[PDB]
Write a protein that binds this DNA or RNA. Structure first.
Ligand SMILES: Nc1ncnc2c1ncn2[C@@H]1O[C@@H]2COP(=O)(O)O[C@H]2[C@H]1O
Ligand SMILES: Nc1ncnc2c1ncn2[C@@H]1O[C@@H]2COP(=O)(O)O[C@H]2[C@H]1O
Ligand SMILES: [Mg+2]
Ligand SMILES: [Mg+2]
Lengths: 226, 225
DNA sequence: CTAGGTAACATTACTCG
DNA sequence: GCGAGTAATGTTAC
DNA sequence: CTAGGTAACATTA
DNA sequence: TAATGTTAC
């Protein structure tokens, strides 16, 4: 696995072909059984992971016991890069939820590659900006809106993780997350997330067949609003 | 021109690009109570604050406000829509009479791509922000209001100190409780009774303008047991 | 069942010709 | 040395 | 005053 | 067995 295969992942897309193909120069394989830790939020991160198979959850856990699911990453995802670029410890907790395999990249190699072909820095920056926006809109979502709108804005944001650049009218969606996973992302409780999803359905915002939600984008945008 | 080292991002530069090539600020000022730019807007310019207080905030159609930051001297804002083609991501309001220096998109970026280990600086900044913002998000999501206030005081104290943390540290906070309610995504009266709560529980004491925080009582109000 | 939001009212505190 | 314009703080009843 | 949390219980593939 | 739905408070 080293073609134009490295263009599938965020950040690494957007590279010149030289650094790219030559870039499976510095991956090692690894794998993690279903239900195990890759690393913890305390930890030292001198390696960045790139996901080939499986589902890995990035989440914040609090001493009280509470969880904020930051992301569920599957094939084509990139995580663990902040503590690479920035001297700081890991900023979240990475758990394999199902049997997963990826490729790891070292700190010294990566960074040398950045500083060697420096318009790749540019790529990485456009990524961190992207994240910062994503995260601030999450924060606004959780702060200024109620739970129905929170769920609505979650569906519209993922229906931009799929379309984006703009948006039909009725779009089916394979969501792959349980409602416990949605409760964890939205910083709410399972039963109330459930009643909210059902609410969106009974109000004509969505309908749910098994694995598939046909969302009504717009019909969903004013539930997301007033 | 070691004056350009006072601001985030620009600190951390080689002296060549720093004293020079910055070369590329215009003066500008904004009266107390006015808009610099709006969240819709096109941002091809980045601001660097010399005097005054400017609030960066998100406003919703419903009318609600999330204060993202109150920046004063030594602050840098408006850089995301520079680096990234996208519109402005928040709303910048001068709360008091403010003055700054503006830097254009084309100049800035040319400077990045000309001395490329400055990119490195900028990245360490965006990482910093991303962490800051995710810890905010965790704060607002997994904790109650007393802990939210507590974690706000510790974050502003780890910004003044950081890398050390004493035991009792006084703090000049400069924000009203309405400003704290707006940052924490809560309501003024409940923020007030929370602050008072921290005081009556021995976490802080408030003299006029100054809060002597007790870092550690304050850390387990920020937590459980 | 509970931590908060909202409207409304009273004081203190800045502050500016 | 104000008196008139604002805020900022604290509390209470929904 | 009331969204939204919590503990528990039922229906479902 | 896990995923979804509901209820009382
Ligand atoms: N807000 C966020 N959005 C998406 N991914 C994040 C966020 N915060 C942290 N991460 C990822 O989680 C990783 C945890 O370890 P690092 O902090 O080394 O690198 C981090 C990022 O790759
Ligand atoms: N999470 C955040 N934390 C601090 N400042 C932010 C955040 N999001 C946006 N900003 C600032 O607000 C500015 C709004 O316009 P820009 O998006 O051009 O640049 C932005 C940043 O300077
Ligand atoms: Mg969102
Ligand atoms: Mg905080």
């Amino acid at each position: 696995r080293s073609s134009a295969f490295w263009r599938s992942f965020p950040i690494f897309e957007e590279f010149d072909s030289e650094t790219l193909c030559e870039l499976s120069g510095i991956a090692s394989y690894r794998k993690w059984s279903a239900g195990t830790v890759i690393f913890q939020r305390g930890d030292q991160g001198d390696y960045m992971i790139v996901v080939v198979s499986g589902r890995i959850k990035l989440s914040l856990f609090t001493p009280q016991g509470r969880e904020l699911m930051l992301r569920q990453h599957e094939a084509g995802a990139l995580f663990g890069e902040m503590a690479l670029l920035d001297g700081q410890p890991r900023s979240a907790d990475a758990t394999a939820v199902t049997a997963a395999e990826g490729y790891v990249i070292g700190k010294k190699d990566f960074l040398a590659l950045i500083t060697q072909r420096p318009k790749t820095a540019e790529a990485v920056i456009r990524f961190l900006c992207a994240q910062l926006r994503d995260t601030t809109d999450r924060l606004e979502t959780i702060a200024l809106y109620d739970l129905n709108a929170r769920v609505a804005r979650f569906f519209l944001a993922t229906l931009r993780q799929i379309h984006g650049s703009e948006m039909p009218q009725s779009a089916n969606l394979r969501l792959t997350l349980s409602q416990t996973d949605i409760a964890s992302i939205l910083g709410a409780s399972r039963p109330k997330v459930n009643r909210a999803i059902l609410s969106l359905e009974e109000s004509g915002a969505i309908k749910r067949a098994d694995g598939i939600i046909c969302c009504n984008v717009g019909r969903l945008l004013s539930i997301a609003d007033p």
